[PDB]
Structures are given as structure tokens and as C-alpha cells.
Write a protein that binds this ligand. Structure first.
Ligand SMILES: Cc1ccnc2c1NC(=O)c1cccnc1N2C1CC1
Ligand SMILES: [Mg+2]
Lengths: 545, 403
RNA sequence: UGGCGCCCGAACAGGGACUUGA
């Protein structure tokens, strides 16, 4: 009693069905397999084909014995299917439901008939062989999930059409049915759905066996009115390995979406340049406190709320230093739908404003995925500071909607390069050259007063030579300088106004730039006899060229 | 009889992933897709079709009704041979010389003819669901899809007979449809041109179906002019001219650089000598002339670069090879209220491509100066064109940004 | 046995900046 339409399945073009000899199994395995096949055949989902069909697929039973058929060759030969539900719904995007069930559909893929022209391709043999074939979707097959999902969607369509209030979600085989009605009528509606599915052959557990809330789904603990992640337990040990810190980082990342203020930047940094899993990397001083603070965050229960379409969506971003941003997406105060963190320094040179914009992009992209609308942000950056940034920036940055929240860690531009030359300052023509093979470079500057300087550099690339030359200009000078660097890379490094950088040399450069009250960074093409640049290359290139 | 359609050899159906959409866009899409299915334009499909195409909903200019567009760029590339060689639309070279050109919309006429059964599976698209709480509704096109470059190629057979009475009654009117639109150009008065367009529109409604190209002028590079030439000003001028030498072979900076021999402060007003005055005059004369040796190559796809000059001013260059700008312009801001940059970039992209379609008949490959996530999320909101060009995201070098 | 999220590494392709030799 399964009147379900069979989805046509066609083999890939130019390839024929699997032809693999079934490796002999032990006597116990053979007896278990034949017993399982005999009963399954009785159910009507298995039939005998004899030697007429040449295709075959090996089988093996894994300990009762659970039969497993490896469709490796068939999965790589069947036409690609479109698994529409590639992702999963975040709990924050759901809505408060008064009552919900799970309705775990028994024999999910074993109740949907298989295409009549394709059953001969899923053939398999049982050693004495007794060849069989699947008349329904077999477990482990590539097309079994997509076809079953479509079959259930079509089965639920007549019921969902007549029950608009009831919300039904199918992940793999469980049907999370939310009604928002009274428990007395909700149970009756569930019974109606259970009988409707039974009409199509699908079986569901009795009301006495229905799982009670909260429902453990994909790492979450979903109560009818609130959601939370599964209990996160951080190992308490001293000898921390790469694999163990991997577990710690992944678990903290999972908890980050609800628990606020979780930092994983230091722990992730501990994974740089490490390959073997047995490397006993001791927790650094900068990361031990961070781990203890996270343990303090995770030592209490934090329960999120569900989306309310009749309320405004807010996303208050916060800054905790070291290029780490935390956002609490909430609709009502202290009722965060879902917290998060954006610890990702895109590129080696970025500032707070650019990082904040990237965090905004991340929040907008996920909010649209989860809620389909961009939240009303509450950023800490001043309105004028943002205007000063995006108007004098080369990208098309734009923040949709946001007010100003006066949190202690405000976002600001630490320094701004002068737009015009400085009258009365001292010009610094800075350049550097690095030897091609010896890796020895030089950096120097020349000024109007005649000041000269050249510092030998070792194991420094050419780019670092230009950066060092600028650093020297920022060091041996006053509060007003007109640096003339003939390297476009240096301009890219400085004109972007990075608040912090991965490299220490740039960090020193920006540290000196902040001190300067007025700094101007000009540019002249190299090898053109322009001003003091030729007199600088004549100094910084003596033993290099 | 449906015209057979086959993809390019060795190419398989478009398996693109749908970009997430806002609640308003998803609701509108379902509202209009259900009506399309009711009318037979599209039909539902099962899970046996692995081909998907992105779908976005937009509000057409001077309209409030949602207009679905399908990102058929990947399919257009797959069917490139078919719509570029098997069936093609000749480009009238006189369209770009017309006083007034109006971009009509004849895309609704493609639904009047069926699509080849063996090709419908490649036009499938998915409508995303909010939060993925329910599987996205999957459809396929039973008729010539809008936005697919093969649709105008197949429909040109009926289009020629549709426009024949008008093309014969008004031989001075040049008509050229690229993807879904219908560029009508004429050397008539604006009021009379609109009257003619109204007559053409009636000619299209019976069968069941603004631009000023003469106002387009290149934006030549102009050097700054001032009486006090400080060392920094000359340093910037020399650098700009040195970069311009790649575009203009005749640019020379030997005399200008001769003035900067010694080490001098950036705020020193060094006076230009007679030889340098002549050198600057020659550079000015060269920079106010079209680039020599540059010609359009139909076999090479156009490339468009966009720069953000700031204060709402955007400069763009269309070229096929580096330093071979076929057309340089400046997109003065039209909307944005000094607060939106993505909206202005989208408007610039639409204007640039519309110019390319009118001139060369193809959409240039864009190099947008914008973050991938910012554009991918907000380009669909301000988009109002039935067509989509190819774009890539790159970082604009500071030197070439000075125009 | 496969898929998915994140990190590290390598081989890849093009785009940009720069150095040296011819
Ligand atoms: C795991 C899951 C995924 C998507 N939606 C839901 C659920 N499960 C729930 O328990 C749930 C809880 C609260 C509201 N909706 C819920 N449901 C909806 C169906 C009623
Ligand atoms: Mg040099």
C-alpha cells in the first residue's frame, strides 16, 4: 500500500551498470543475510532475478546483523542528483511553537518504490548464489536521499495544503511537526498526519513512543519555546595537542553561536605551522587566560529564543580587541536570537573599520540565509568616522542600516594620511634594495638638509626593504614628514590605514604613524631621476647592484 | 515545431548554487512562479534533474511589480556556439550614431513559443526557502526562458516578420535586440521619436508581444593646470604621464623630470622652463587625442574596468587588451543621496553595459572595485536590467585610479 | 563508504607589484 510515483533514474552516459563479484562471507554472515533477505522479500521490497540480469553489487553484514550494501560503483555511476536541502535551518530562524513531535518514519528509504527500469542495476548476490534486486530505495545509494525527500514532500503537500498552521520539517527521516495549537488538538492533528502517512505506506511510531522535548537535532537542544546547543565539555588537561586543540576550537566555535564572548583567536593561532598531531604544544600565556575565560562563559546555561516576525531584528556588533568581533542578534533586550563571532583578518593588512564592514557582510549574509532580512545593526563606529572612511576609500563599501552604540571599545581611525603636502616639514625620499641571491638588503633615506643613513638588512625581501626604509623615515624625523616612497606595494600597505597587521614591521610602521601628527606619503616612479630618489638608490644600492 | 538546442561539445548542464534571497524576493518569486506554472510557462520537476540556475527578483524601472530574472550567464556560455554561430543577430553599426535610442522590453514574447524538450532540463532553477525550513521549489522552463541568450536567437525568426511591416513603413528606424530588450534608434525629435515608438508598440501588441548615443563622448585625460607648480604637483604629473605613456606611446617626461634633478622639498614652487613648457604643451596635445592603433576585435570579449573616484564620481574604461581603452567615460551620479556606493556601482554597471550593447553588441567583463560579499548581496536589489553581464572582483591599483 | 563545516600544507591556473640577468 505505497502508491508513490517512481522518480525516473538514468545511468550516466557511456557507462554501464556495476559488475562486481561478491566476495564470499563467513557462514554466520551468509545465514544472517539470507534470513534478512528472505524476510525482506516477504515484505515485497525484494525480488529474485536469476542469471538473466548480469549486473551485480557486493554485500556484507555488519554486527542482530545489519545488512549493508556498498553502492560505491553505483553511486559514482548514477546521474548526479540535486540534494536541495544542502544546509540545515538554524534554530534562531525558527518560530516559537507550542508543541512539536518528531514522528520518526520507520523504513524511510525502504517504503519508496524504485524506478522500474533501474531496479535491475541495484542487483546483488548472496553466497549459497541467490541473486536479488531492490524494488525500493536502498540505504547508502546516492539517489536515495533526494528521491525520498521529494517523495515525502509530495506526500506532505496534500496535508500541508489543508493545514497551513501546522509547520512540518523533514531533515533525513524525522518529521518535526510544529502546530502551535493546544496539546489536546495538537495530538489529534498528529494522529491525522500519522494516518495520512500510513495511507501512503509510511509508518510512524505510536504516540506512546514519540520523543519528548527537547529534541537533540544536529548538535542543538531544541525546546518548544527556546533553543540551545548540546552540552559542550572542554577537556581539562595540561598537555594539549594539535588534534585536541582542534576539538577545543571546533567545540568553542559551536558554542559561539549562542554563548557570547567566546574567543578562539589565540587557540587558532596555536595551530599555525603545525602538521603532526602528536606535537605537544604547551598553551601560551596569551591563550591560557582566554581558555579559562571561555570556560567561565560555558560554565552557565545560555538559552536562546526563536524568531518573531512581528518584531524588529537587531544585531549589535562588539569589539574585544586583536581583530575579534562579536555580534548578538536579538529582537528584544537580553533575548539574543543567536550570538556570533567574526575572527577572520581577511588579508595581512586591515583596520577596525574594514574588519567591522566585513563582519557586517557576514552578518547580513547569514541573516538573509536564516531570516531573509538584514537586521538593524548597532555598530560602535561613529557616524562621522564611517563617513570619513567610506568617502575616502577605494572600495564600494556601504552599511545598510545602523545606529551608534557607545560601547567602551569604540571603532576609530588611529591615523589619517595628509591629503596635501605639509609646509615646513622635512621630505624623506625612502627606498631599499634586496640582493637576489644573498638575501641581504639595505634601507635608507635622503632629506633636504642633507641627512644620510643606510642600515644593513639581513634575510629581508625587497618589499621588506621598502617597508623598513619607510620605518626609518618615521623614526629619524619629527612630527611632520613627507615620505616619498617609489614602491606601489608600500602605498598599498600604508594608504589602506591598517590598525594592525600580521607582520611586525608593518605594526612598527603604523605604531610610528600614529605618533606623527601630520604624515604625507607621496610616490614617484622608480628609475626616472626624480628628486632625491636617484640619490637614494645611489646609497641603498651599492653592494646590491 | 521546437527548434533543437544542444550545448557546446564536452560541456554539461549548469550546476550552479542558488544565492540566498530576502523574504520579500522569495515571496514575490513564489507568487509569480506559481502563476507561470498555471499558465504553462514553467513546470515542476523531481530530484532527477541536477541542473540549477540562480534566480533573482527585481523591480523594473518606473514600476512596482516584481520581475523575475534568471542568472543564465553560465548557460549562455554553455550554449555559446549555438547562439553565436548557429543562430545570431547581426549588429547594426549605425545604432550607436542614432540621436535617440529606446530600450524596449520584448522579453514577454519569448513565452509564446515552446522550448525543445531535450533542452528544458538545462533551464531548471530553484526557488530558495527562508532558513531552508522546507525544500526549495524546483521548476523548469517549458518555453524560451527570459535572460537566456538562445531565446532571442530562436525568436528572431518570428521577430523579423513581426517587425517587417514597421521596418518597411519606416526604413530609417534601426532596430536591434540583444537578449530580451529591443534597442530602437532614430534620428527624430524626442517627441516624434516617442510617437514612432508608440506606433511600434502597437505593432507589437497586435502580434501578441531612453538613450542618447550622440550625447556619448569619450573622457580624455586632462592634465592639471595651475600657475604655482610645487615639487609634489610635478612629481604627481610626471608619475601620471609615465603611466599614461603605456596607453599613449608619444608621452615623454624627460624634460619635466629634468627640473627635479636635485633633492627639493615637496612644498617648493619650482618654475617651469621654456623647454618644459613645450614638453607640457606636447603632452597636453597628445592626451586630448584618441589612442592610435586601437580597434574593436569581435573575436575578443570586451573587458570593463570601474574606478571609484569618490564624491559619487565613477570613471570606467572598456578595453580588450591592457592600455587599449576602446571607450573611457565618467559616470556622474544619478541616485544614492551621497550614502550608497553599491547602488551607484550597480547603476554604473548597467549604464556601461547598455552602452556596450548599443555600440559593440556585447556585455564587457567587469572588474568591480567592491568586496565579493557586499556586491553578491546587494547588486540584486538595485538591478533593473533583464540582462546580466560577466563581472570579476579585483583591487584597483592607486596609480590607474587617477583619471 | 560518502557528504558537510573549519584549520594547516602542496600542486595549480590566471591578475597585480617588484628585483636581477640577457
Ligand atoms: C529541528 C527543527 C528544524 C526545523 N524546524 C523545527 C525543528 N524542530 C523543533 O523542535 C522546533 C522547535 C520550535 C519551533 N519549531 C521547530 N521546528 C518546526 C517544525 C516545527
Ligand atoms: Mg629602487
Amino acid at each position: 500500500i505505497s502508491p508513490i510515483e517512481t522518480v525516473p533514474v538514468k545511468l550516466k552516459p557511456g557507462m554501464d551498470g556495476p559488475k562486481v563479484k561478491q566476495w564470499p562471507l563467513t557462514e554466520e554472515k551468509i545465514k544472517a543475510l539470507v534470513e534478512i533477505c528472505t524476510e525482506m522479500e516477504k515484505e515485497g521490497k525484494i525480488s529474485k532475478i536469476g542469471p538473466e540480469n548480469p549486473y551485480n553489487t557486493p554485500v556484507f553484514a555488519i554486527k542482530k546483523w545489519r545488512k549493508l550494501v556498498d553502492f560505491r560503483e553505483l553511486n559514482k555511476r548514477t546521474q548526479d542528483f540535486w540534494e536541495v536541502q544542502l544546509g540545515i535551518p538554524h534554530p534562531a530562524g525558527l518560530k516559537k511553537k507550542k508543541s512539536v513531535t518528531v514522528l520518526d518514519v520507520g523504513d524511510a528509504y525502504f517504503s519508496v518504490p524504485l524506478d522500474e527500469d533501474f531496479r535491475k542495476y541495484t542487483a546483488f548476490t548472496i553466497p549459497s548464489g541467490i541473486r536479488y534486486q531492490y524494488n525500493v530505495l536502498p540505504q547508502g545509494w546516492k539517489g536515495s536521499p533526494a528521491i525520498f525527500q521529494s517523495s515525502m514532500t509530495k506526500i506532505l503537500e496534500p496535508f500541508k495544503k489543508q493545514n497551513p498552521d501546522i509547520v512540518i520539517y523533514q531533515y533525513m527521516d524525522d518529521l518535526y511537526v510544529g502546530s502551535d495549537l493546544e496539546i489536546g488538538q495538537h495530538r489529534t492533528k498528529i494522529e491525522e498526519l500519522r494516518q495520512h502517512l500510513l495511507r501512503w505506506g509510511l509508518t510512524t511510531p505510536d504516540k506512546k513512543h514519540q520523543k519528548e522535548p527537547p529534541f537533540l537535532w544536529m548538535g542543538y537542544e531544541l525546546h518548544p519555546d527556546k533553543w540551545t546547543v548540546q552540552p559542550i565539555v572542554l577537556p581539562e588537561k595540561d598537555s594539549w595537542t594539535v588534534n585536541d586543540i582542534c576539538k577545543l576550537v571546533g567545540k568553542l566555535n559551536w558554542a559561539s553561536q549562542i554563548y557570547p564572548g567566546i574567543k578562539v583567536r589565540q587557540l587558532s593561532k596555536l595551530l599555525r605551522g603545525t602538521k603532526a598531531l602528536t606535537e605537544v604544544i604547551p598553551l601560551t600565556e596569551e591563550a591560557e587566560l582566554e581558555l579559562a575565560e571561555n570556560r567561565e562563559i560555558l560554565k552557565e546555561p545560555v538559552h536562546g529564543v526563536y524568531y518573531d516576525p512581528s518584531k524588529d531584528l537587531i544585531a549589535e556588533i562588539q569589539k574585544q580587541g586583536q581583530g575579534q568581533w562579536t555580534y548578538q542578534i536579538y529582537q528584544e533586550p537580553f533575548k539574543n536570537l543567536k550570538t556570533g563571532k567574526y575572527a577572520r583578518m581577511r588579508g595581512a593588512h586591515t583596520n577596525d573599520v574594514k574588519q567591522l564592514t566585513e563582519a557586517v557582510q557576514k552578518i547580513t549574509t547569514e541573516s538573509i540565509v536564516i531570516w531573509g532580512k538584514t537586521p538593524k545593526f548597532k555598530l560602535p563606529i561613529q557616524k562621522e568616522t564611517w563617513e570619513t572612511w567610506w568617502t575616502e576609500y577605494w572600495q564600494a563599501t556601504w552599511i545598510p542600516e545602523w545606529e551608534f552604540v557607545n560601547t567602551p571599545p569604540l571603532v576609530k581611525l588611529w591615523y589619517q594620511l595628509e591629503k596635501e603636502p605639509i609646509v615646513g616639514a622635512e621630505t624623506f625620499y625612502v627606498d631599499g634594495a634586496a640582493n637576489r641571491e644573498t638575501k641581504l638588503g639595505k634601507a635608507g633615506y635622503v632629506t633636504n638638509k642633507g641627512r644620510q643613513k643606510v642600515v644593513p638588512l639581513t634575510n629581508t625581501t625587497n618589499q621588506k626593504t621598502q617597508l623598513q626604509a619607510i620605518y626609518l623615515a618615521l623614526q629619524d624625523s619629527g612630527l611632520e614628514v613627507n615620505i616619498v616612497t617609489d614602491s606601489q606595494y608600500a602605498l598599498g600597505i600604508i594608504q589602506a590605514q591598517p590598525d594592525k597587521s600580521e607582520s611586525e614591521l608593518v605594526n612598527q610602521i603604523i605604531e610610528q604613524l600614529i605618533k606623527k601628527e601630520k604624515v604625507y606619503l607621496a610616490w614617484v616612479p622608480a628609475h626616472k631621476g626624480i628628486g632625491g630618489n636617484e640619490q637614494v638608490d645611489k646609497l641603498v644600492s651599492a653592494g646590491i647592484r | 515545431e521546437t527548434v533543437p538546442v544542444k550545448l557546446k561539445p564536452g560541456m554539461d548542464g549548469p550546476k550552479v548554487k542558488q544565492w540566498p534571497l530576502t523574504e520579500e524576493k522569495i515571496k514575490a518569486l513564489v507568487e509569480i512562479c506559481t502563476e507561470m506554472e498555471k499558465e504553462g510557462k514553467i513546470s515542476k520537476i523531481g530530484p532527477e534533474n541536477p541542473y540549477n540556475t540562480p534566480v533573482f527578483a527585481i523591480k523594473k524601472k518606473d514600476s512596482t511589480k516584481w520581475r523575475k530574472l534568471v542568472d543564465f550567464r553560465e548557460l549562455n556560455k554553455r550554449t555559446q556556439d549555438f547562439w553565436e554561430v548557429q543562430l545570431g543577430i547581426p549588429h547594426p553599426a549605425g545604432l550607436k550614431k542614432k540621436k535617440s535610442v529606446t530600450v524596449l522590453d520584448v522579453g514577454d514574447a519569448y513565452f509564446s513559443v515552446p522550448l525543445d524538450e531535450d533542452f528544458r532540463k538545462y533551464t531548471a532553477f530553484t526557488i530558495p526557502s527562508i532558513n531552508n525550513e522546507t525544500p526549495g521549489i524546483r521548476y523548469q522552463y517549458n518555453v524560451l526562458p527570459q535572460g537566456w541568450k538562445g531565446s532571442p536567437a530562436i525568436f528572431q525568426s518570428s521577430m523579423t516578420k513581426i517587425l517587417e511591416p514597421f521596418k518597411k513603413q519606416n526604413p530609417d528606424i534601426v532596430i536591434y535586440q540583444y537578449m530580451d530588450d529591443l534597442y530602437v534608434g532614430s534620428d527624430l525629435e524626442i517627441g516624434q521619436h516617442r510617437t514612432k515608438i508608440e506606433e511600434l508598440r502597437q505593432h507589437l501588441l497586435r502580434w501578441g508581444l531612453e538613450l542618447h548615443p550622440d550625447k556619448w563622448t569619450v573622457q580624455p585625460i586632462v592634465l592639471p593646470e595651475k600657475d604655482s607648480w610645487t615639487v609634489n604637483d610635478i612629481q604627481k604629473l610626471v608619475g601620471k604621464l609615465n603611466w599614461a605613456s603605456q596607453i599613449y606611446p608619444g608621452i615623454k617626461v624627460r624634460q619635466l623630470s629634468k627640473l627635479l634633478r636635485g633633492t627639493k622639498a615637496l612644498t617648493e614652487v619650482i618654475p617651469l622652463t621654456e623647454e618644459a613648457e613645450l614638453e607640457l604643451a606636447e603632452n597636453r596635445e597628445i592626451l586630448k587625442e584618441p589612442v592610435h592603433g586601437v580597434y574593436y576585435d569581435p573575436s575578443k570579449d570586451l573587458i570593463a574596468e570601474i574606478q571609484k573616484q569618490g564624491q559619487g564620481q565613477w570613471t570606467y574604461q572598456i578595453y580588450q587588451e591592457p592600455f587599449k581603452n576602446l571607450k573611457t567615460g565618467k559616470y556622474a551620479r544619478m541616485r544614492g543621496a551621497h550614502t550608497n556606493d553599491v547602488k551607484q556601482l550597480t547603476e554604473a554597471v548597467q549604464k556601461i553595459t547598455t552602452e556596450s550593447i548599443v555600440i559593440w553588441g556585447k556585455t564587457p567583463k567587469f572588474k568591480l572595485p567592491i568586496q565579493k560579499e557586499t556586491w553578491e548581496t546587494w547588486w540584486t536589489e538595485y538591478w533593473q536590467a533583464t540582462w546580466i553581464p560577466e563581472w570579476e572582483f579585483v583591487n584597483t591599483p592607486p596609480l590607474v585610479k587617477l583619471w
